[PDB]
Amino acid sequence: DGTEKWRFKTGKAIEASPVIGEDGTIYVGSNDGHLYAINPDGTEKWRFKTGKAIEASPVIGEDGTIYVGSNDGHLYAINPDGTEKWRFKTGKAIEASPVIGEDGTIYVGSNDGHLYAINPDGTEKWRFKTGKAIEASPVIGEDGTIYVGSNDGHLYAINPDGTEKWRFKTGKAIEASPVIGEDGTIYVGSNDGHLYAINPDGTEKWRFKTGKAIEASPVIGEDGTIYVGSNDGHLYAINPDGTEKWRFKTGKAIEASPVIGEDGTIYVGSNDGHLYAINPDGTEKWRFKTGKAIEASPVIGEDGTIYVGSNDGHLYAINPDGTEKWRFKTGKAIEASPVIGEDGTIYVGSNDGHLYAINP
């Protein structure tokens, strides 16, 4: 129905998506430096104080441990009951969510230029230094290889034991996580205006030029087509062999990844303030107007409803035919993707400091 179930006020703006635990608890970081655990009914379960803003979504381990970074430089491991399990100090702020390996190893980038590998018990397993800050979360391959980008423009492939496998130079800084295809191919966008497709062994498979920094990760459709947005406002559909399938123009920079619907429709947000629905063949299905730039990916509900945040303060729910279902007005601006619960409740963080729970 689009009605407010409850809202939970935190001290400051919420800038990253909430994460839902197996028991329904909703975890979200706020700029007030705390990690909140909110009960499904809107009451507080606990809050964990850190020294600075938490800008990235928390990650939940197999044992229920919630891991989240903070601008105070530390990776925190929080028990389900809200007590600290351990804390690991890095040089600079950590801007992106951690990643957990098959054996429980927690990988996290910090602004000090190193990729850290932290054991389940909190001790350092290893660290690997890059030339510059690691902006985006690392990605792990089927063999445990850790792929991570860096402001120094290089893509690194790090082995589970911490040694370097290879690195792949691109023209400029890499700001979005790599995405790996089913055949093992590693795809990453660069600020140098190209999409790079890199083989598991470190050689280039192909490169595809866009002309402006990509800044968001590729998404792969079921048929292998790779879709990437660029700051030039175009959405590219690239075949697995590196040739172009089609391109679609949006008004302004595409700063978040596209999402593909069950029927093949490709949805993408634009800084021009519109949400585009693009048919598999490259034609436009529809264009839905919001009042300001859409900085985060749309999320699709089980009924097919598309939910997007907007800088104009509203949460939009759009029917698959392009008409509006409803809009919900938050105080300031919605920076992160909505997350949908097991009962269909849509949770979203807003810059007004509140976490909202919106009915379907």
Side-chain angles (χ1 to χ4, degrees), residues 1-8 10-11 13-21 23-88 90-91 93-128 130-131 133-168 170-171 173-181 183-208 210-291 293-331 333-360:
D1 60 40
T3 60
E4 182 179 324
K5 183 170 171 57
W6 51 257
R7 67 179 185 272
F8 187 102
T10 70
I14 299 172
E15 296 181 356
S17 291
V19 175
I20 299 172
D23 63 359
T25 302
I26 305 92
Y27 301 97
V28 67
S30 147
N31 285 350
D32 69 11
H34 298 208
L35 177 67
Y36 290 84
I38 301 167
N39 288 310
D41 67 2
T43 46
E44 185 175 294
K45 194 182 171 163
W46 49 258
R47 71 217 289 253
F48 182 98
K49 182 153 236 166
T50 82
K52 294 190 177 182
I54 297 168
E55 301 206 10
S57 300
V59 178
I60 304 170
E62 193 66 30
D63 62 0
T65 304
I66 303 103
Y67 300 92
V68 62
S70 153
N71 291 350
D72 72 14
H74 280 90
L75 173 66
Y76 290 87
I78 308 154
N79 293 306
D81 67 8
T83 59
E84 187 176 58
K85 184 175 178 172
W86 52 257
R87 139 177 128 156
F88 184 84
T90 68
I94 308 154
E95 300 291 273
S97 300
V99 181
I100 304 171
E102 185 180 301
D103 66 359
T105 304
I106 305 89
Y107 301 104
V108 67
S110 147
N111 287 353
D112 68 11
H114 299 74
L115 191 273
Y116 289 88
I118 302 92
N119 288 313
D121 68 359
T123 58
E124 185 177 324
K125 185 178 184 173
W126 52 257
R127 70 178 186 168
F128 189 95
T130 70
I134 297 172
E135 181 56 330
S137 294
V139 179
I140 308 164
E142 287 290 340
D143 65 357
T145 302
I146 301 90
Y147 300 98
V148 59
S150 153
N151 284 347
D152 71 11
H154 292 274
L155 174 67
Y156 293 85
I158 300 169
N159 284 309
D161 68 12
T163 57
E164 186 178 78
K165 192 178 278 274
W166 51 256
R167 64 191 231 211
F168 187 100
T170 82
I174 298 170
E175 71 196 290
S177 294
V179 176
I180 318 164
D183 66 9
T185 302
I186 299 93
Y187 304 94
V188 71
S190 178
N191 291 172
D192 69 9
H194 303 76
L195 176 69
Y196 293 90
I198 303 164
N199 291 310
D201 67 11
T203 60
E204 192 179 281
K205 187 171 197 316
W206 52 257
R207 174 201 51 171
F208 184 97
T210 62
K212 290 283 188 180
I214 293 170
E215 301 196 318
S217 288
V219 65
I220 303 170
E222 178 179 351
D223 70 7
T225 304
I226 308 104
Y227 301 92
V228 293
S230 153
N231 286 354
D232 63 8
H234 292 83
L235 176 67
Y236 297 88
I238 308 154
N239 291 311
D241 63 9
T243 62
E244 187 171 304
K245 187 175 181 179
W246 52 256
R247 65 175 67 207
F248 184 94
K249 182 68 167 55
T250 71
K252 295 185 177 238
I254 300 171
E255 296 185 1
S257 297
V259 173
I260 303 169
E262 187 171 295
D263 67 355
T265 304
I266 304 93
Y267 301 91
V268 65
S270 176
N271 287 357
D272 69 7
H274 296 70
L275 177 66
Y276 292 83
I278 303 168
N279 289 317
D281 66 12
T283 55
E284 180 176 307
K285 185 177 177 135
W286 52 257
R287 170 178 145 98
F288 186 97
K289 185 173 324 270
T290 78
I294 301 171
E295 294 183 323
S297 291
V299 177
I300 300 173
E302 296 301 356
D303 60 355
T305 301
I306 303 102
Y307 302 98
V308 77
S310 177
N311 287 349
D312 71 10
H314 298 81
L315 178 64
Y316 292 87
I318 304 164
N319 293 313
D321 67 358
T323 57
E324 185 174 324
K325 185 183 160 189
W326 49 257
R327 68 183 70 172
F328 180 83
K329 186 174 299 204
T330 72
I334 299 174
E335 297 188 1
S337 297
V339 170
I340 302 173
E342 74 293 348
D343 61 358
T345 303
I346 301 97
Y347 300 93
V348 56
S350 156
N351 287 351
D352 67 13
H354 302 70
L355 174 67
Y356 291 83
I358 306 300
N359 290 316

mmCIF file of all heavy atoms in Angstrom, residues 225-259:
data_model
loop_
_atom_site.group_PDB
_atom_site.id
_atom_site.type_symbol
_atom_site.label_atom_id
_atom_site.label_comp_id
_atom_site.label_asym_id
_atom_site.label_seq_id
_atom_site.Cartn_x
_atom_site.Cartn_y
_atom_site.Cartn_z
ATOM 1 N N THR A 225 25.329 -10.711 -21.945
ATOM 2 C CA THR A 225 25.524 -9.300 -22.251
ATOM 3 C C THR A 225 25.950 -8.545 -20.995
ATOM 4 O O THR A 225 25.384 -8.735 -19.913
ATOM 5 C CB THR A 225 24.239 -8.704 -22.825
ATOM 6 O OG1 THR A 225 23.836 -9.470 -23.966
ATOM 7 C CG2 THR A 225 24.467 -7.269 -23.261
ATOM 8 N N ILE A 226 26.958 -7.684 -21.138
ATOM 9 C CA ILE A 226 27.456 -6.879 -20.027
ATOM 10 C C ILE A 226 26.932 -5.458 -20.191
ATOM 11 O O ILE A 226 27.135 -4.838 -21.243
ATOM 12 C CB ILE A 226 28.994 -6.894 -19.961
ATOM 13 C CG1 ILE A 226 29.526 -8.325 -19.972
ATOM 14 C CG2 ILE A 226 29.487 -6.198 -18.700
ATOM 15 C CD1 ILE A 226 30.116 -8.742 -21.310
ATOM 16 N N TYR A 227 26.277 -4.938 -19.156
ATOM 17 C CA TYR A 227 25.692 -3.602 -19.205
ATOM 18 C C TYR A 227 26.464 -2.676 -18.272
ATOM 19 O O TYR A 227 26.623 -2.983 -17.086
ATOM 20 C CB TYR A 227 24.224 -3.630 -18.775
ATOM 21 C CG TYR A 227 23.331 -4.522 -19.602
ATOM 22 C CD1 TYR A 227 23.116 -5.842 -19.229
ATOM 23 C CD2 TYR A 227 22.689 -4.050 -20.743
ATOM 24 C CE1 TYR A 227 22.297 -6.668 -19.964
ATOM 25 C CE2 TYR A 227 21.861 -4.874 -21.487
ATOM 26 C CZ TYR A 227 21.672 -6.182 -21.091
ATOM 27 O OH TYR A 227 20.861 -7.014 -21.825
ATOM 28 N N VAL A 228 26.925 -1.538 -18.796
ATOM 29 C CA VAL A 228 27.615 -0.535 -17.987
ATOM 30 C C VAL A 228 27.121 0.864 -18.322
ATOM 31 O O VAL A 228 26.831 1.174 -19.481
ATOM 32 C CB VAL A 228 29.151 -0.592 -18.163
ATOM 33 C CG1 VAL A 228 29.705 -1.864 -17.592
ATOM 34 C CG2 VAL A 228 29.538 -0.451 -19.628
ATOM 35 N N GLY A 229 27.033 1.707 -17.300
ATOM 36 C CA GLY A 229 26.659 3.092 -17.463
ATOM 37 C C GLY A 229 27.934 3.910 -17.458
ATOM 38 O O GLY A 229 28.968 3.456 -16.974
ATOM 39 N N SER A 230 27.864 5.132 -17.975
ATOM 40 C CA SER A 230 29.051 5.972 -17.971
ATOM 41 C C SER A 230 28.673 7.392 -17.585
ATOM 42 O O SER A 230 27.500 7.773 -17.611
ATOM 43 C CB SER A 230 29.758 5.933 -19.338
ATOM 44 O OG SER A 230 30.492 7.123 -19.592
ATOM 45 N N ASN A 231 29.695 8.170 -17.207
ATOM 46 C CA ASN A 231 29.461 9.573 -16.887
ATOM 47 C C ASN A 231 29.027 10.378 -18.100
ATOM 48 O O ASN A 231 28.530 11.493 -17.932
ATOM 49 C CB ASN A 231 30.708 10.202 -16.260
ATOM 50 C CG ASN A 231 30.922 9.756 -14.825
ATOM 51 O OD1 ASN A 231 30.088 9.062 -14.247
ATOM 52 N ND2 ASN A 231 32.036 10.178 -14.235
ATOM 53 N N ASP A 232 29.184 9.837 -19.303
ATOM 54 C CA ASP A 232 28.715 10.504 -20.507
ATOM 55 C C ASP A 232 27.213 10.346 -20.684
ATOM 56 O O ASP A 232 26.656 10.856 -21.661
ATOM 57 C CB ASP A 232 29.462 9.976 -21.744
ATOM 58 C CG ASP A 232 29.221 8.491 -22.006
ATOM 59 O OD1 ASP A 232 28.367 7.876 -21.329
ATOM 60 O OD2 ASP A 232 29.900 7.930 -22.892
ATOM 61 N N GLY A 233 26.551 9.666 -19.750
ATOM 62 C CA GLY A 233 25.126 9.470 -19.811
ATOM 63 C C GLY A 233 24.664 8.306 -20.661
ATOM 64 O O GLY A 233 23.452 8.069 -20.734
ATOM 65 N N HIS A 234 25.572 7.552 -21.283
ATOM 66 C CA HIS A 234 25.142 6.420 -22.088
ATOM 67 C C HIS A 234 25.160 5.145 -21.254
ATOM 68 O O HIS A 234 26.007 4.963 -20.376
ATOM 69 C CB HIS A 234 26.088 6.199 -23.275
ATOM 70 C CG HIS A 234 26.056 7.276 -24.316
ATOM 71 N ND1 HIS A 234 26.778 8.445 -24.194
ATOM 72 C CD2 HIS A 234 25.429 7.344 -25.514
ATOM 73 C CE1 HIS A 234 26.581 9.197 -25.262
ATOM 74 N NE2 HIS A 234 25.766 8.552 -26.078
ATOM 75 N N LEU A 235 24.248 4.234 -21.583
ATOM 76 C CA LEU A 235 24.234 2.870 -21.071
ATOM 77 C C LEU A 235 24.672 1.972 -22.217
ATOM 78 O O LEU A 235 24.043 1.978 -23.280
ATOM 79 C CB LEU A 235 22.854 2.462 -20.555
ATOM 80 C CG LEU A 235 22.796 0.998 -20.096
ATOM 81 C CD1 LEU A 235 23.656 0.772 -18.862
ATOM 82 C CD2 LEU A 235 21.374 0.539 -19.850
ATOM 83 N N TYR A 236 25.730 1.197 -22.018
ATOM 84 C CA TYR A 236 26.200 0.335 -23.088
ATOM 85 C C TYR A 236 25.821 -1.114 -22.812
ATOM 86 O O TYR A 236 25.876 -1.579 -21.670
ATOM 87 C CB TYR A 236 27.714 0.458 -23.255
ATOM 88 C CG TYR A 236 28.159 1.848 -23.655
ATOM 89 C CD1 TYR A 236 28.423 2.812 -22.690
ATOM 90 C CD2 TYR A 236 28.279 2.209 -24.991
ATOM 91 C CE1 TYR A 236 28.815 4.091 -23.038
ATOM 92 C CE2 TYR A 236 28.674 3.489 -25.354
ATOM 93 C CZ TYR A 236 28.940 4.426 -24.373
ATOM 94 O OH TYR A 236 29.340 5.699 -24.722
ATOM 95 N N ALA A 237 25.435 -1.813 -23.874
ATOM 96 C CA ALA A 237 25.202 -3.250 -23.862
ATOM 97 C C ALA A 237 26.280 -3.867 -24.737
ATOM 98 O O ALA A 237 26.328 -3.611 -25.946
ATOM 99 C CB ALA A 237 23.806 -3.600 -24.374
ATOM 100 N N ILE A 238 27.150 -4.655 -24.123
ATOM 101 C CA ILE A 238 28.320 -5.201 -24.792
ATOM 102 C C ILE A 238 28.203 -6.715 -24.875
ATOM 103 O O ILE A 238 27.832 -7.372 -23.894
ATOM 104 C CB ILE A 238 29.589 -4.781 -24.027
ATOM 105 C CG1 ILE A 238 29.580 -3.269 -23.828
ATOM 106 C CG2 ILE A 238 30.840 -5.222 -24.770
ATOM 107 C CD1 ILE A 238 30.369 -2.810 -22.642
ATOM 108 N N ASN A 239 28.529 -7.263 -26.043
ATOM 109 C CA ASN A 239 28.487 -8.704 -26.199
ATOM 110 C C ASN A 239 29.711 -9.308 -25.520
ATOM 111 O O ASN A 239 30.714 -8.620 -25.308
ATOM 112 C CB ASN A 239 28.466 -9.089 -27.677
ATOM 113 C CG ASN A 239 27.164 -8.721 -28.367
ATOM 114 O OD1 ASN A 239 26.073 -9.024 -27.875
ATOM 115 N ND2 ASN A 239 27.273 -8.089 -29.529
ATOM 116 N N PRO A 240 29.655 -10.595 -25.162
ATOM 117 C CA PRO A 240 30.829 -11.232 -24.539
ATOM 118 C C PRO A 240 32.104 -11.153 -25.369
ATOM 119 O O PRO A 240 33.200 -11.215 -24.797
ATOM 120 C CB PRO A 240 30.374 -12.686 -24.349
ATOM 121 C CG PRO A 240 28.884 -12.592 -24.248
ATOM 122 C CD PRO A 240 28.493 -11.503 -25.201
ATOM 123 N N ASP A 241 32.009 -10.996 -26.688
ATOM 124 C CA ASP A 241 33.213 -10.906 -27.505
ATOM 125 C C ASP A 241 33.786 -9.496 -27.581
ATOM 126 O O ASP A 241 34.775 -9.286 -28.290
ATOM 127 C CB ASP A 241 32.937 -11.451 -28.916
ATOM 128 C CG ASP A 241 31.883 -10.652 -29.676
ATOM 129 O OD1 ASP A 241 31.462 -9.572 -29.212
ATOM 130 O OD2 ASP A 241 31.467 -11.121 -30.757
ATOM 131 N N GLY A 242 33.214 -8.536 -26.855
ATOM 132 C CA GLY A 242 33.710 -7.178 -26.853
ATOM 133 C C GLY A 242 33.056 -6.245 -27.850
ATOM 134 O O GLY A 242 33.314 -5.035 -27.801
ATOM 135 N N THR A 243 32.215 -6.757 -28.745
ATOM 136 C CA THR A 243 31.532 -5.883 -29.685
ATOM 137 C C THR A 243 30.311 -5.248 -29.021
ATOM 138 O O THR A 243 29.773 -5.755 -28.033
ATOM 139 C CB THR A 243 31.111 -6.656 -30.935
ATOM 140 O OG1 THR A 243 30.194 -7.695 -30.574
ATOM 141 C CG2 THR A 243 32.324 -7.271 -31.618
ATOM 142 N N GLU A 244 29.862 -4.132 -29.589
ATOM 143 C CA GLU A 244 28.707 -3.431 -29.049
ATOM 144 C C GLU A 244 27.409 -4.069 -29.526
ATOM 145 O O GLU A 244 27.251 -4.373 -30.712
ATOM 146 C CB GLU A 244 28.732 -1.952 -29.445
ATOM 147 C CG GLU A 244 27.639 -1.118 -28.772
ATOM 148 C CD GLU A 244 27.804 0.382 -28.989
ATOM 149 O OE1 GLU A 244 28.880 0.924 -28.651
ATOM 150 O OE2 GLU A 244 26.861 1.019 -29.505
ATOM 151 N N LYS A 245 26.479 -4.265 -28.595
ATOM 152 C CA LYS A 245 25.156 -4.756 -28.944
ATOM 153 C C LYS A 245 24.258 -3.569 -29.271
ATOM 154 O O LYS A 245 23.619 -3.535 -30.328
ATOM 155 C CB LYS A 245 24.590 -5.592 -27.792
ATOM 156 C CG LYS A 245 23.278 -6.300 -28.078
ATOM 157 C CD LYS A 245 22.904 -7.187 -26.894
ATOM 158 C CE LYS A 245 21.607 -7.943 -27.132
ATOM 159 N NZ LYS A 245 21.280 -8.819 -25.967
ATOM 160 N N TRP A 246 24.231 -2.582 -28.380
ATOM 161 C CA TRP A 246 23.499 -1.333 -28.553
ATOM 162 C C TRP A 246 23.977 -0.359 -27.483
ATOM 163 O O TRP A 246 24.689 -0.728 -26.547
ATOM 164 C CB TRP A 246 21.970 -1.510 -28.535
ATOM 165 C CG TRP A 246 21.376 -2.261 -27.370
ATOM 166 C CD1 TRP A 246 20.910 -3.545 -27.388
ATOM 167 C CD2 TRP A 246 21.213 -1.797 -26.023
ATOM 168 N NE1 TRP A 246 20.442 -3.899 -26.152
ATOM 169 C CE2 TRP A 246 20.622 -2.848 -25.292
ATOM 170 C CE3 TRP A 246 21.501 -0.597 -25.367
ATOM 171 C CZ2 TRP A 246 20.318 -2.736 -23.933
ATOM 172 C CZ3 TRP A 246 21.199 -0.487 -24.016
ATOM 173 C CH2 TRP A 246 20.611 -1.551 -23.316
ATOM 174 N N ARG A 247 23.571 0.895 -27.642
ATOM 175 C CA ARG A 247 23.788 1.949 -26.663
ATOM 176 C C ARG A 247 22.501 2.739 -26.486
ATOM 177 O O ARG A 247 21.696 2.855 -27.414
ATOM 178 C CB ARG A 247 24.918 2.893 -27.086
ATOM 179 C CG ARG A 247 24.621 3.695 -28.351
ATOM 180 C CD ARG A 247 25.736 4.682 -28.636
ATOM 181 N NE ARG A 247 26.988 4.013 -28.980
ATOM 182 C CZ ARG A 247 28.192 4.536 -28.772
ATOM 183 N NH1 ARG A 247 28.307 5.745 -28.237
ATOM 184 N NH2 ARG A 247 29.283 3.860 -29.113
ATOM 185 N N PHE A 248 22.317 3.293 -25.288
ATOM 186 C CA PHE A 248 21.127 4.077 -24.984
ATOM 187 C C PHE A 248 21.553 5.314 -24.212
ATOM 188 O O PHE A 248 22.301 5.216 -23.235
ATOM 189 C CB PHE A 248 20.117 3.273 -24.160
ATOM 190 C CG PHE A 248 18.829 4.006 -23.902
ATOM 191 C CD1 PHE A 248 17.744 3.826 -24.741
ATOM 192 C CD2 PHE A 248 18.694 4.850 -22.812
ATOM 193 C CE1 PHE A 248 16.553 4.490 -24.509
ATOM 194 C CE2 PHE A 248 17.509 5.519 -22.582
ATOM 195 C CZ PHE A 248 16.437 5.336 -23.425
ATOM 196 N N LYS A 249 21.101 6.471 -24.678
ATOM 197 C CA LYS A 249 21.455 7.754 -24.089
ATOM 198 C C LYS A 249 20.518 8.181 -22.959
ATOM 199 O O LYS A 249 19.291 8.177 -23.122
ATOM 200 C CB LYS A 249 21.461 8.832 -25.173
ATOM 201 C CG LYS A 249 21.862 10.218 -24.696
ATOM 202 C CD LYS A 249 23.342 10.213 -24.304
ATOM 203 C CE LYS A 249 23.911 11.615 -24.103
ATOM 204 N NZ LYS A 249 23.172 12.440 -23.129
ATOM 205 N N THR A 250 21.099 8.553 -21.824
ATOM 206 C CA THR A 250 20.362 9.181 -20.737
ATOM 207 C C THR A 250 20.902 10.599 -20.646
ATOM 208 O O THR A 250 21.962 10.905 -21.196
ATOM 209 C CB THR A 250 20.497 8.446 -19.391
ATOM 210 O OG1 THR A 250 21.819 8.604 -18.858
ATOM 211 C CG2 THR A 250 20.184 6.975 -19.554
ATOM 212 N N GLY A 251 20.181 11.465 -19.937
ATOM 213 C CA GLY A 251 20.513 12.880 -19.998
ATOM 214 C C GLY A 251 21.845 13.217 -19.361
ATOM 215 O O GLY A 251 22.591 14.054 -19.876
ATOM 216 N N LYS A 252 22.181 12.551 -18.257
ATOM 217 C CA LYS A 252 23.367 12.881 -17.480
ATOM 218 C C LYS A 252 24.013 11.602 -16.962
ATOM 219 O O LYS A 252 23.528 10.489 -17.198
ATOM 220 C CB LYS A 252 23.054 13.854 -16.333
ATOM 221 C CG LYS A 252 22.588 15.228 -16.805
ATOM 222 C CD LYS A 252 22.395 16.196 -15.653
ATOM 223 C CE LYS A 252 22.007 17.572 -16.170
ATOM 224 N NZ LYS A 252 22.975 18.607 -15.712
ATOM 225 N N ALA A 253 25.140 11.792 -16.275
ATOM 226 C CA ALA A 253 25.961 10.706 -15.755
ATOM 227 C C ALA A 253 25.142 9.639 -15.037
ATOM 228 O O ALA A 253 24.232 9.938 -14.259
ATOM 229 C CB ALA A 253 27.015 11.268 -14.801
ATOM 230 N N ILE A 254 25.481 8.386 -15.314
ATOM 231 C CA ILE A 254 24.900 7.229 -14.645
ATOM 232 C C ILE A 254 25.883 6.820 -13.559
ATOM 233 O O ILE A 254 26.954 6.280 -13.854
ATOM 234 C CB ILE A 254 24.650 6.070 -15.617
ATOM 235 C CG1 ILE A 254 23.691 6.483 -16.731
ATOM 236 C CG2 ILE A 254 24.193 4.830 -14.859
ATOM 237 C CD1 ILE A 254 23.586 5.461 -17.834
ATOM 238 N N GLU A 255 25.527 7.072 -12.300
ATOM 239 C CA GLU A 255 26.453 6.877 -11.196
ATOM 240 C C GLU A 255 26.180 5.614 -10.395
ATOM 241 O O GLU A 255 26.854 5.380 -9.390
ATOM 242 C CB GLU A 255 26.438 8.093 -10.271
ATOM 243 C CG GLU A 255 26.931 9.367 -10.935
ATOM 244 C CD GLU A 255 27.009 10.529 -9.970
ATOM 245 O OE1 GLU A 255 26.688 10.340 -8.776
ATOM 246 O OE2 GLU A 255 27.404 11.631 -10.403
ATOM 247 N N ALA A 256 25.240 4.780 -10.824
ATOM 248 C CA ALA A 256 24.953 3.552 -10.105
ATOM 249 C C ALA A 256 24.682 2.452 -11.118
ATOM 250 O O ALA A 256 24.257 2.716 -12.247
ATOM 251 C CB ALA A 256 23.758 3.713 -9.151
ATOM 252 N N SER A 257 24.913 1.218 -10.691
ATOM 253 C CA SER A 257 24.765 0.073 -11.571
ATOM 254 C C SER A 257 23.319 -0.114 -12.039
ATOM 255 O O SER A 257 22.368 0.194 -11.315
ATOM 256 C CB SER A 257 25.243 -1.194 -10.862
ATOM 257 O OG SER A 257 26.629 -1.128 -10.558
ATOM 258 N N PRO A 258 23.133 -0.585 -13.264
ATOM 259 C CA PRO A 258 21.802 -1.008 -13.716
ATOM 260 C C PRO A 258 21.361 -2.314 -13.057
ATOM 261 O O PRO A 258 22.170 -3.103 -12.565
ATOM 262 C CB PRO A 258 21.975 -1.166 -15.230
ATOM 263 C CG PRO A 258 23.438 -1.394 -15.429
ATOM 264 C CD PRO A 258 24.143 -0.652 -14.336
ATOM 265 N N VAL A 259 20.044 -2.518 -13.023
ATOM 266 C CA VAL A 259 19.457 -3.758 -12.527
ATOM 267 C C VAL A 259 18.553 -4.295 -13.626
ATOM 268 O O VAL A 259 17.842 -3.526 -14.282
ATOM 269 C CB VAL A 259 18.677 -3.576 -11.205
ATOM 270 C CG1 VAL A 259 17.947 -4.865 -10.836
ATOM 271 C CG2 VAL A 259 19.630 -3.199 -10.078
#
